Amino acid sequence: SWNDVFQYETNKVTRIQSVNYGTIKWILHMTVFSYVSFALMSDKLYQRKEPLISSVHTKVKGVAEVTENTKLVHGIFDTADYTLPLQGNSFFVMTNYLKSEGQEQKLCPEYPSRGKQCHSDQGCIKGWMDPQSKGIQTGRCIPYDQKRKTCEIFAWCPAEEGKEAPRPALLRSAENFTVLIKNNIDFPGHNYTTRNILPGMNISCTFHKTWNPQCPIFRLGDIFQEIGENFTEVAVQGGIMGIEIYWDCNLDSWSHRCQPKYSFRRLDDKYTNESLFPGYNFRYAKYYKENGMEKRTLIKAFGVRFDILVFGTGGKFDIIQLVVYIGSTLSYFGLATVCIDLIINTYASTCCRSRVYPSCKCCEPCAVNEYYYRKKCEPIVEPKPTLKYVSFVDEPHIWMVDQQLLGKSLQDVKGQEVPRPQTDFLELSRLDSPDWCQCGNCLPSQLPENRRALEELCCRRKPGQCITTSELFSKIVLSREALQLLLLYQEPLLALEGEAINSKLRHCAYRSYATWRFVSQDMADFAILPSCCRWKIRKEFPKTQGQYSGFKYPY
Amino acid sequence: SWNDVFQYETNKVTRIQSVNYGTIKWILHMTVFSYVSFALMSDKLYQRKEPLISSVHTKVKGVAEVTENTKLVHGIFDTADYTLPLQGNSFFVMTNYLKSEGQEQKLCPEYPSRGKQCHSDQGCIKGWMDPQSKGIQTGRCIPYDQKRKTCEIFAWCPAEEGKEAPRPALLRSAENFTVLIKNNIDFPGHNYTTRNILPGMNISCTFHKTWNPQCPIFRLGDIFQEIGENFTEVAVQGGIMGIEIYWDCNLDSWSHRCQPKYSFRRLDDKYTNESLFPGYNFRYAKYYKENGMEKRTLIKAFGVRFDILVFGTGGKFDIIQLVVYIGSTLSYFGLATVCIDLIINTYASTCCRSRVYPSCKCCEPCAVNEYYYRKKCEPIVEPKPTLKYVSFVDEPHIWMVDQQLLGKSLQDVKGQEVPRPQTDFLELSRLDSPDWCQCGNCLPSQLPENRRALEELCCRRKPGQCITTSELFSKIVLSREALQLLLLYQEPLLALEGEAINSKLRHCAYRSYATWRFVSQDMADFAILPSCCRWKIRKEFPKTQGQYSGFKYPY
Amino acid sequence: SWNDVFQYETNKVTRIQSVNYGTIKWILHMTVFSYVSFALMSDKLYQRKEPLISSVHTKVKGVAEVTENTKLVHGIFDTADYTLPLQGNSFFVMTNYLKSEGQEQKLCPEYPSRGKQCHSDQGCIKGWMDPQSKGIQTGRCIPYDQKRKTCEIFAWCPAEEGKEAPRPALLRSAENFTVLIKNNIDFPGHNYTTRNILPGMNISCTFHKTWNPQCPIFRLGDIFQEIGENFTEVAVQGGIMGIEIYWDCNLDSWSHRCQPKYSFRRLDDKYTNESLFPGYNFRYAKYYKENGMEKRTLIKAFGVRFDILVFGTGGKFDIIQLVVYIGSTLSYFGLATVCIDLIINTYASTCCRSRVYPSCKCCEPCAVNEYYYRKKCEPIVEPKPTLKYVSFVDEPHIWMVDQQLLGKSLQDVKGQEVPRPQTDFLELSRLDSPDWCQCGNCLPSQLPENRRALEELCCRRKPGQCITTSELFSKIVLSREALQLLLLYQEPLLALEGEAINSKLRHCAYRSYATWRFVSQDMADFAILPSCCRWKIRKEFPKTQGQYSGFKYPY
Ligand SMILES: Nc1nc2c(ncn2[C@@H]2O[C@H](COP(=O)(O)OP(=O)(O)O)[C@@H](O)[C@H]2O)c(=O)[nH]1
Ligand SMILES: Nc1nc2c(ncn2[C@@H]2O[C@H](COP(=O)(O)OP(=O)(O)O)[C@@H](O)[C@H]2O)c(=O)[nH]1
Ligand SMILES: Nc1nc2c(ncn2[C@@H]2O[C@H](COP(=O)(O)OP(=O)(O)O)[C@@H](O)[C@H]2O)c(=O)[nH]1
Ligand SMILES: Clc1cccc([C@@H]2NNNN2Cc2cccnc2)c1Cl
Ligand SMILES: Clc1cccc([C@@H]2NNNN2Cc2cccnc2)c1Cl
Ligand SMILES: Clc1cccc([C@@H]2NNNN2Cc2cccnc2)c1Cl
Ligand SMILES: *[C@@H]1O[C@H](CO)[C@@H](O)[C@H](O)[C@H]1NC(C)=O
Ligand SMILES: *[C@@H]1O[C@H](CO)[C@@H](O)[C@H](O)[C@H]1NC(C)=O
Ligand SMILES: *[C@@H]1O[C@H](CO)[C@@H](O)[C@H](O)[C@H]1NC(C)=O
Ligand SMILES: *[C@@H]1O[C@H](CO)[C@@H](O)[C@H](O)[C@H]1NC(C)=O
Ligand SMILES: *[C@@H]1O[C@H](CO)[C@@H](O)[C@H](O)[C@H]1NC(C)=O
Ligand SMILES: *[C@@H]1O[C@H](CO)[C@@H](O)[C@H](O)[C@H]1NC(C)=O
Ligand SMILES: *[C@@H]1O[C@H](CO)[C@@H](O)[C@H](O)[C@H]1NC(C)=O
Ligand SMILES: *[C@@H]1O[C@H](CO)[C@@H](O)[C@H](O)[C@H]1NC(C)=O
Ligand SMILES: *[C@@H]1O[C@H](CO)[C@@H](O)[C@H](O)[C@H]1NC(C)=O
Ligand code: NA
Ligand SMILES: [Zn+2]
Ligand SMILES: [Zn+2]
Ligand SMILES: [Zn+2]
Ligand SMILES: [Zn+2]
Ligand SMILES: [Zn+2]
Ligand SMILES: [Zn+2]
């Protein structure tokens, strides 16, 4: 059993000294290797990739001046006037505003927005919580002004919801504002961390696509016009702008490159439906107390919400990933073998010689694939009990009968023809008749009727001379000296006496005839002797007082 | 060397015309292919998958009315009264509040919360910064009211921290509020971008699981009751609700489907410990100046923080991914070969014939696997110096002796028995004695004692007639004419004279005996001639004035 | 065709009973299996991994006392005084502040910051929107104080932008503040969800690296000092701290482990350039009305923004992933075959015997690889029309001539020498002359001149006796009886009469000579008979009234 452990199985191979096959094999191997390497390096499949974790710190610089109205009001807007305390992944810059000062919780006519005019008390319902007007209707219709009327609502009054944003936008100068974005990114699995601002960067820089791609100071107007967006128009109703920071980071020492790439993308739909809150704005309430009453100043602030979208992956060499990829791609190196073996398989077919080659003379010298096929493959059939082989001296090939003999004589069964092997020339270089019979020497079988059809076989398919009449038949089969020599070869001390040697000689004669007429031991083992030859052999070496068993399934 | 480059190696194969083996092979191949294809299409393993980057814009609509108290106060709450300016991935809706107006930074008794009652000055420490009371203790105990006492703290007074949230929740009507969620998602690697609102969507829609799964307008109460949550109860102490937007996006043109799926999940633990801040609330300070003093109004706002969780992947066909997957799965197509080869290997074993087949007659016709095994495999042993083969005319097989001859005669060494090859019938179809000896013709070896055991071998294991006595021995071995014919065959012009031809004849006789009794040249090359036969051969073709070398390791 | 479907191809193999090869094979298989299993379990390659979606709820506890100034002001700071309403992935804690109360929109001298002193009106431009001073310059120079001057700007006055943060930080006590972080994480694909606080956790716990790694209550000072950061120093100008919550979650039931790991990392660059806004701060405006004027209190709040970075993956067993990994690694099990086959290939080379073995006697017994190579591989050359084989009785090997015969006699073409196969001993164990000629029996070819060089071949390369003179030549080639026996063997009933049998005998003699002198039918099929032997054969079996075709390309 240890010897069994100590075994190695190696495949038998046929080395072909073919220029075309070698060329094809090497070309296919080179192609597979080149593609595998290109995929490995282009996609960095040898690298474990980890998503980043990002922190964003934004600082907006800029000052705006507004002059509006009934008295003229001159206002200055600094960061605390147009920015919220948040300075993370999103920062808001106010670009326009509607101000409703001195609101009190009381009854008032709703602002006439979106054709909300009232003509009669039936145009509104009492106690209806209108989120559009942002009040609760009292059910009555009251005059908003001299010309139009609007229902009364309990809300923050004077109610002005629905009024249009100023145009032009009051804080247009925000296009000239700048934002400094500090982005700290980390790959914890790879234990790496960097930031978008490194020592040596000039502080007077402003971002540009080509001149200053790494400058993290962005002018808002430049952001808008880089992607063909009009800051002046968006400033009226507001919008959402995304600043994308892509980190395609290679953390390998020999190829270390972890630098941010900045892009811009409008995130709010320019063509948003009017009822779906187009643009970007929010209502902020400044609460105070005046005249012993709780009052509220409502600022509808329109502006651009800048969303900093930080994304990317960090790739670092990982042996497991490379091993997995190489293992996945290893099977592709069998492409050359598959292709060349398929070529040999298909071109060895006889169909190519009869039809393709005469039509196409260029594909003619590819007939060598038959020699390759025969030096590569050994066909064998299942040695089933019904397997029989018959050879007729008239015919030049052997016939296989794999079907059950249902009474019909073996002579009448057609079967499938198979080629006759070439008896090694090297070894051969040395010095009333039954109705089915056609030679006149066959005799009825002595077997039981149920299996008598097996022995109902003649040496030929058409009438003619019996094969037994040939002197070579006597030399190979009936020659007692030759059979005795063969027996001695196998059994040097065999006793050439007794009824036993005669049975041994009979079996040796059967084997000799089968090998001579079938060549291969595969066919000879399942060959069926003709009745004439079988009975002549038995006459030469008969059985004293027994009945012949006949062919035996060797399996 | 170029010829070497121009080589192709093809495996030698044995084609078996077996119905069962072909059936098994094709069934296994179909199963492997079906599973590989199913995995490829189900998991989209041909697609490169990229995580999305999302931007969320939320707009809350809704109006609430509150009537509380000592004077009756009728208050209206619109978006600016219950929402914060943030409208991104999270939005907060106030559902309840505790108001402490007119706070001044001074000394006051802490609110009696969680059994914080005071009975003596020793129940509290001076200068202790109590974050629960949100003040610094003065070390003294003072009467909070007529019945209970509480220590004095320097804080915003009147201190009311620890008071219970109103019940029912004041802003219960928030269940009727609606939120419009605009979700812009982008796959930058795939250069794709879409949003959850497309042209044609009805604006009066409200989200529903089945009727309106794509409507991005959600009623908060509907959100809560979709997952079996009670908005009325959560509104008292607040909570956190997550609106999950899953983007399972297929970006292939032939299978393009990038649509959001909305789900809801409570994010705050319903059973949070009382000391771990159950629910959701925050304290907001409204600062003002009254009576020449800095005053503060503290609003403890309880509400639902809605967290919009946007996640998903975009898959687009990538040739590299498909190639990698196919390469990974290619090796599985060898399953049929592995299984059928294992069947042939195991069923060819003799163990199955002796035990399994007699017990199980159904597994009997599988004995054909032995023929397959012998047509597929050629066993060979290592040709080591100790390798020897011995054949005894008494025994029917050959014996291998691979162990060193440590003085013990080769006759006495047992070794391991091996089968005798069938001499090709096709080629064969033509026309005082030593103590270890058992034939009476062996003679002591003339070799040095150290290696004399090699030649101490007899033609038989038991007493009997010598193999040399057989006439076939003389015909094959001693026949000078046959050996001369063989020599001429190899060397046509060999000069049949001189002491050289005699040595050539002796070696040819050795080879002839070895081939006759061992058949294979593998065994004959390492076979050991019996002393009797060896010395008879030497007598026929002796050496004039030299000592015989004897067997030579051929390796 | 169905029989074709019912076929199975199995590779022919040579089983080697070698201890070293078996050892190498099993060692390599064990190594490959061990590494594959280690990679599978270490990297959980059998698991589908899904990124988490996280929700963070933060609650800060802590109270601070400040005493500053011209009148002494004693202020208390609770959560509503130093925290913003946001309680999600980021929370801000105020640690220092600069307060500018009672600002009015009017003209004032800018604060003298960063050497902004003015000496003349030419040092500033009118209408210049200075974002540093946060005002619009009027173009005039005015005295900020008695000693220094600064230009006039329309801004919120008194302008104090650029004033240094207080030192020490006013809210130093914030180091003693605590934050409770509730983290709800979910894997939607795996349909799993958990949180960082589970029942049974003690509420008096405070986080520690070793003692309380799972306590989600963190002291800010402890956070800073865990990573060697000084909270007192950072509190002056502020900063950004990241609380990383890593979820390495295994969702398999047998290996379920989904627990958070807390780490800390400073996110703001300690060495940020002075002009790049070092630290963290924001300007918040408190608007009010005083004396009938809109006034503003500007608080420059410096503090630590704590960013909770939640990341991780959830791994759950997936059959497809395991199948893909196993398929990727299957090809690696062919390493043993590749290595051992390469060893056999290289050590069988003759180059190793001539040079390596004499120099290195240790690598000598590896000569057995030649026997393995010959039992494993069968070399065959392409049977092209130019393929010819010639054997000279003088030389001991055969010669291959694969080049076109451009008039030059085949005798003069060198070609490449090839070894002579061993004629199976088993089958052989039985009983004026042309200028190019060197035997005296060759005759000029009768073929057309263009192809006459093919037959211009002699039996030897040097002068000597003709091979035809040997009696074995007559026995094998000229023996009519032997050729007739061979013909009968193939055709038992062949009629031994007529001009046909003579041509059959001539062809059989050609084959017999080719097989005798070339052994293999591969070489014999393309062998070229010497002119002497060819013409002697023709003399024995001549053609009556025709011209001999001569050698025919068998392909
Ligand atoms: N191949 C082959 N073998 C045969 C044939 N007939 C008989 N045998 C073999 O010869 C043996 C029977 O010998 P036979 O003379 O017919 O009957 P016996 O006297 O009882 O031995 C069996 O083991 C068969 O394998 C035949 O036609 N073809
Ligand atoms: N297989 C085999 N070969 C042998 C045996 N004895 C001798 N030889 C071969 O014969 C050669 C020696 O011939 P031998 O007559 O014994 O001595 P010599 O006169 O010096 O040549 C060696 O090369 C051996 O390979 C044997 O028992 N078995
Ligand atoms: N291998 C080999 N075959 C030959 C040679 N010469 C002739 N033949 C074969 O013999 C056949 C021609 O016979 P030949 O006596 O030369 O002329 P024929 O009388 O017209 O048949 C062809 O089919 C050749 O394949 C030779 O030198 N070598
Ligand atoms: Cl959106 C925003 C961002 C930052 C600050 C403010 C602030 N809040 N109260 N008054 N605001 C200032 C202000 C004045 C005049 C017109 N518009 C806005 C807002 Cl409203
Ligand atoms: Cl949480 C929140 C969201 C939005 C606005 C407010 C606002 N802030 N100052 N007063 N608030 C209004 C208000 C009045 C009465 C009771 N509760 C709250 C808060 Cl507090
Ligand atoms: Cl950053 C921040 C966080 C929370 C609250 C506040 C609040 N806003 N108006 N006054 N503030 C309080 C206050 C008083 C005195 C000194 N500093 C700050 C701020 Cl400013
Ligand atoms: C931005 O600045 C430039 C130059 O300072 C000025 O011409 C332009 O009008 C400014 N934009 C706005 C919207 O005021
Ligand atoms: C990660 O990198 C830092 C800096 O190089 C190093 O100090 C640390 O040991 C590394 N490994 C960790 C943090 O596990
Ligand atoms: C941008 O929008 C403004 C409206 O505010 C308009 O006057 C201007 O012409 C627009 N610019 C372009 C380039 O369309
Ligand atoms: C929500 O609206 C319905 C119908 O308008 C009303 O019956 C219900 O009371 C409202 N819910 C609350 C909490 O007020
Ligand atoms: C991405 O898509 C847009 C729109 O189809 C196209 O204009 C652009 O060229 C594409 N490639 C990019 C942005 O690299
Ligand atoms: C929801 O909670 C409220 C308490 O505010 C309670 O009155 C009501 O019955 C609850 N509803 C359900 C269905 O449990
Ligand atoms: C934090 O608390 C400890 C003990 O209560 C105290 O000694 C220390 O001074 C405090 N830190 C600050 C900055 O006040
Ligand atoms: C997910 O898990 C929950 C809880 O175990 C279960 O009720 C549900 O059916 C699962 N599948 C889903 C939500 O698709
Ligand atoms: C931390 O910084 C403060 C300055 O506010 C300094 O006094 C103290 O010595 C520093 N601590 C250490 C350990 O460096
Ligand atoms: Na593979
Ligand atoms: Zn007959
Ligand atoms: Zn017959
Ligand atoms: Zn003996
Ligand atoms: Zn003997
Ligand atoms: Zn000659
Ligand atoms: Zn000659």
CATH code, domain carrying C100 = 2.60.490.10
Residue B112 per-residue DSSP state: -
Distances (CA, A) of C343 to C17, C20, C336, C339, C347: 16, 12, 11, 6, 6
C511 CB contacts (<8 Å, ≥6 apart)?
A425, C524
B264 CB contacts (<8 Å, ≥6 apart)?
B223, B224, B226, B227, B241, B242, B243, B244
Distances (CA, A) of A379 to A48, A375, B190, C436: 49, 11, 53, 46
Residue B477 forms part of a structural domain: yes
Q: Indicate the burial class of A292 (C-beta count within 10 angstroms; 0-12, 13-18, 19 or more).
A: exposed
Give the Cα separation of B447 and A21 in Å (integer).
55
Give the Cα separation of A158 and A99 in Å (integer).
11
Q: Indicate the burial class of A152 (C-beta count within 10 angstroms; 0-12, 13-18, 19 or more).
A: buried
Q: Looking at the structure, tell me whether residues A74 and A168 fall in a common domain.
A: yes
Can you say whether residue A178 is alpha, beta or left, with left for phi > 0 and alpha for psi between -120 and 50 degrees?
A: beta
Angle, helix C19-42 to helix C319-330, in steps of 10 degrees? 150
What sign results for the dihedral spanned by CA atoms C123, C126, C129, C135? positive
Q: Looking at the structure, tell me whether residues C402 and C458 fall in a common domain.
A: yes
Which residues 270-329 on chain B approach chain A with CB closer than 8 angstroms? 286, 288, 290, 320, 323-325, 327-328
- The number of beta carbons lying within 10 Å of the beta carbon of residue B285 is 16
Token pair for C313:
């993956």
Token pair for B115:
């059994």
Give the Cα separation of A410 and A404 in Å (integer).
10
How many Å from the N-terminal Cα to the C-terminal Cα in chain B? 27
C441 CB-side CA count, 13 A: 19
CA angle B93, B96, B97 (to 5 degrees): 110
Ligand 5 pocket, residue B284 CB under 6 Å: yes
Please say whether the beta carbons of C20 and C340 come within 8 A. no
Domain holding C216, by residue range, is 53-110+161-315
Q: Are strands C8-11 and C416-418 parallel, antiparallel or unpaired?
A: unpaired
Residue type for B463, please? P
Q: Looking at the structure, tell me whether residues C483 and C507 fall in a common domain.
A: yes
Is position B459 annotated in a ligand binding site?
yes
| Residues belonging to chain A | 555
Which among C379, C384, C378, C417 has a CA at the least distance from the CA of C402?
A: C384
CA C451 to chain centre: 58
Last residue of a domain, one of C315, C331, C356: C315
Residue type for C302, please? F
**Do A305 and B87 make contact, defined as CB atoms within 8 angstroms?**
yes
Give the Cα separation of B307 and C87 in Å (integer).
12
Token pair for B233:
């109860």
A74 CB contacts (<8 Å, ≥6 apart)?
A65, A66, A67, C105, C154
Give the Cα separation of C197 and C174 in Å (integer).
24
Helices and strands in chain C, H and E counts? 16, 21
Please say whether the beta carbons of B328 and C327 come within 8 A. yes
Token pair for C438:
């060197």
Token pair for B424:
């090709």
Residue type for C415, please? G
Residue type for C513, please? Y
What sign results for the dihedral spanned by CA atoms C41, C44, C45, C46? positive
Please say whether the beta carbons of A521 and A511 come within 8 A. no
B38 CB contacts (<8 Å, ≥6 apart)?
none
Which among B420, C109, B180 has a CA at the least distance from the CA of A491?
A: B420
C471 CB contacts (<8 Å, ≥6 apart)?
B488
3-class DSSP state of B150: strand
B381 CB contacts (<8 Å, ≥6 apart)?
B387, B400, B402, B522, C16, C17
Give the Cα separation of C44 and B457 in Å (integer).
64
CA angle A147, A151, A154 (to 5 degrees): 130
Residue A341 forms part of a structural domain: yes
Residues of C in contact with B308 (CB under 8 A): none
Residue A553 forms part of a structural domain: no
Residue B485 forms part of a structural domain: yes
The binding site of C for GTP comprises 506-507, 510, 527, 543, 549-550
Please say whether the beta carbons of A299 and A66 come within 8 A. no
Which among A346, A401, A344, A333 has a CA at the least distance from the CA of A373?
A: A344
Give the Cα separation of C165 and A527 in Å (integer).
110
3-class DSSP state of C279: coil
Token pair for B172:
């219960």
Ligand 4 pocket, residue A283 CB under 6 Å: no
Q: Which helix (H) or strand (E) holds B68?
A: strand B64-68
Give the Cα separation of A549 and A553 in Å (integer).
11
A250 CB contacts (<8 Å, ≥6 apart)?
A44, A47, A256, A257, A258, A314, A315
Token pair for A162:
């629905």
CA C402 to chain centre: 44
Residue type for A359, please? S
Give the Cα separation of A369 and A348 in Å (integer).
5
Backbone angles phi, psi at A95, to 5 degrees: -120, -15
Q: Looking at the structure, tell me whether residues B229 and B288 fall in a common domain.
A: yes
**Do C10 and B481 make contact, defined as CB atoms within 8 angstroms?**
no
**Do C307 and A372 make contact, defined as CB atoms within 8 angstroms?**
no
- The number of beta carbons lying within 10 Å of the beta carbon of residue B226 is 16
**Do C10 and B16 make contact, defined as CB atoms within 8 angstroms?**
yes
Residue type for B455, please? E
Give the Cα separation of C431 and C428 in Å (integer).
8
Token pair for C238:
């502020």
Residue C144 forms part of a structural domain: no
Q: Are strands A73-77 and A135-142 parallel, antiparallel or unpaired?
A: unpaired
Which among B544, B94, B26 has a CA at the least distance from the CA of B305?
A: B94
How many Å from the N-terminal Cα to the C-terminal Cα in chain C? 27
Give the Cα separation of A167 and A235 in Å (integer).
9
Please say whether the beta carbons of B51 and C51 come within 8 A. yes
Backbone angles phi, psi at C159, to 5 degrees: -75, 130
DSSP H helical segments within B6-119, as ranges?
A: 19-42, 79-82
Which residues 177-206 on chain B approach chain A with CB closer than 8 angstroms? 177-178, 180, 182, 184, 186, 188, 193, 195, 197, 199, 203
**Radius of gyration of chain C from its Cα atoms, rounded to whole angstroms:** 51
Ligand 2 pocket, residue B510 CB under 6 Å: yes
CA angle B64, B68, B74 (to 5 degrees): 55
Which residues 480-509 on chain B approach chain A with CB closer than 8 angstroms? none
Can you say whether residue A272 is alpha, beta or left, with left for phi > 0 and alpha for psi between -120 and 50 degrees?
A: beta
Give the Cα separation of B376 and C10 in Å (integer).
7
- The number of beta carbons lying within 10 Å of the beta carbon of residue C383 is 19
Q: Looking at the structure, tell me whether residues C532 and C416 fall in a common domain.
A: yes
Q: Looking at the structure, tell me whether residues C24 and C58 fall in a common domain.
A: no
Residue B49 forms part of a structural domain: no
Please say whether the beta carbons of B393 and B457 come within 8 A. no
User: Which ligand 15 atom sits closest to the C-alpha of C231?
Assistant: 1
**Radius of gyration of chain A from its Cα atoms, rounded to whole angstroms:** 51
Give the Cα separation of B139 and C248 in Å (integer).
48
Please say whether the beta carbons of B445 and B551 come within 8 A. no
Backbone angles phi, psi at B440, to 5 degrees: 85, 0
Residue type for C434, please? P
CA angle B313, C86, B130 (to 5 degrees): 135
Q: Are strands A281-290 and A293-317 parallel, antiparallel or unpaired?
A: antiparallel
Give the Cα separation of A458 and A439 in Å (integer).
7
Residue B339 forms part of a structural domain: yes
Q: Looking at the structure, tell me whether residues B190 and B296 fall in a common domain.
A: yes
Residues of C in contact with B284 (CB under 8 A): 80, 85
CA C81 to chain centre: 56
Can you say whether residue B134 is alpha, beta or left, with left for phi > 0 and alpha for psi between -120 and 50 degrees?
A: left
Ligand nearest to the CA of B236: 12
Q: Looking at the structure, tell me whether residues C197 and C244 fall in a common domain.
A: yes
Which among C122, B61, B404 has a CA at the least distance from the CA of A131?
A: B61
Which among A5, A220, A199 has a CA at the least distance from the CA of A91?
A: A220
- The number of beta carbons lying within 10 Å of the beta carbon of residue B28 is 19
CA angle C421, C426, C428 (to 5 degrees): 75
Q: Looking at the structure, tell me whether residues B98 and B222 fall in a common domain.
A: yes
* Residues pairing with C14 in the sheet: A10, B378
Token pair for A98:
């509607």
Token pair for C443:
């005759």
**Do C39 and A320 make contact, defined as CB atoms within 8 angstroms?**
yes
Token pair for A197:
């601002």
Token pair for A424:
């090694």
Q: Which of B382, B426, B491, B525 to mutate to test the interface with C (most CBs of C within 10 A)?
A: B382
CA C456 to chain centre: 60
Which among A463, A440, A454 has a CA at the least distance from the CA of A409?
A: A454
Which among B163, B172, B220 has a CA at the least distance from the CA of B66?
A: B172
Give the Cα separation of A416 and A401 in Å (integer).
7
Please say whether the beta carbons of C151 and C112 come within 8 A. no
B209 CB contacts (<8 Å, ≥6 apart)?
B226
What sign results for the dihedral spanned by CA atoms B482, B486, B489, B495? negative
Q: Please note each residue after which chain C is broken, C-to-N distance over 2.5 A, or write none.
A: 69, 431
* Residues pairing with C219 in the sheet: C178
Give the Cα separation of B12 and A91 in Å (integer).
73
Token pair for A444:
């009825």
CA dihedral angle for residue B486, residue B487, residue B490, residue B493, rounded to 10 degrees: -130
Closest Cβ opposite residue A467 in set C22, C424, C492:
C492
- The number of beta carbons lying within 10 Å of the beta carbon of residue C389 is 23
Token pair for A6:
């100590």
Give the Cα separation of B170 and B189 in Å (integer).
48
Give the Cα separation of A251 and A190 in Å (integer).
8
Q: Looking at the structure, tell me whether residues B396 and B520 fall in a common domain.
A: yes
Give the Cα separation of B236 and B280 in Å (integer).
10
Q: Looking at the structure, tell me whether residues B493 and B536 fall in a common domain.
A: yes
* Residues pairing with C51 in the sheet: C313
Ligand 6 pocket, residue C381 CB under 6 Å: no
Please say whether the beta carbons of A267 and A234 come within 8 A. no
Token pair for A460:
């030929």
3-class DSSP state of A121: helix
SS (H, E, C) C419-485: CCCCCCHHHHCCCCCCCCCCCCCCCCCCCCHHHHHHHCCCCCCCCCCCHHHCHHHHHHHHCHHHHHH
3-class DSSP state of B340: helix
3-class DSSP state of A223: helix
CA angle A201, A205, A208 (to 5 degrees): 110
Residue B370 forms part of a structural domain: yes
Distances (CA, A) of A425 to A435, B466, C424, C514: 38, 35, 11, 10
- The number of beta carbons lying within 10 Å of the beta carbon of residue C52 is 24
CA angle B439, B443, B446 (to 5 degrees): 155
Query: Number of structural domains, chain C?
Result: 3
Tracing tokens 């492997």 back to the chain, one arrives at: B32
Residue A353 contacts C where some CB pair is shorter than 8 Å: no
Distances (CA, A) of A441 to A410, A472, A511, C489: 17, 17, 20, 21
Distances (CA, A) of C250 to C180, C213, C321: 25, 19, 15
Q: Looking at the structure, tell me whether residues C393 and C528 fall in a common domain.
A: yes
Give the Cα separation of B255 and A151 in Å (integer).
52
Tracing tokens 């294979």 back to the chain, one arrives at: B520
- The number of beta carbons lying within 10 Å of the beta carbon of residue A372 is 25
Residue type for C529, please? L
Ligand 9 pocket, residue A297 CB under 6 Å: no
E strand spans, B353-428 = 377-381, 388-391, 398-401, 416-418
Please say whether the beta carbons of C56 and C181 come within 8 A. yes
Which among B455, B506, B501, B498 has a CA at the least distance from the CA of B478?
A: B506
Residue B472 contacts A where some CB pair is shorter than 8 Å: yes
**Radius of gyration of chain B from its Cα atoms, rounded to whole angstroms:** 51
- The number of beta carbons lying within 10 Å of the beta carbon of residue B368 is 19
E strand spans, A52-168 = 53-61, 64-68, 73-77, 90-109, 129-130, 135-142, 150-157
Whether the bond between A168 and the residue before it is cis, its omega within 30 degrees of 0, is yes
* Residues pairing with A527 in the sheet: A389
* Residues pairing with A317 in the sheet: A47
Give the Cα separation of B281 and B269 in Å (integer).
14
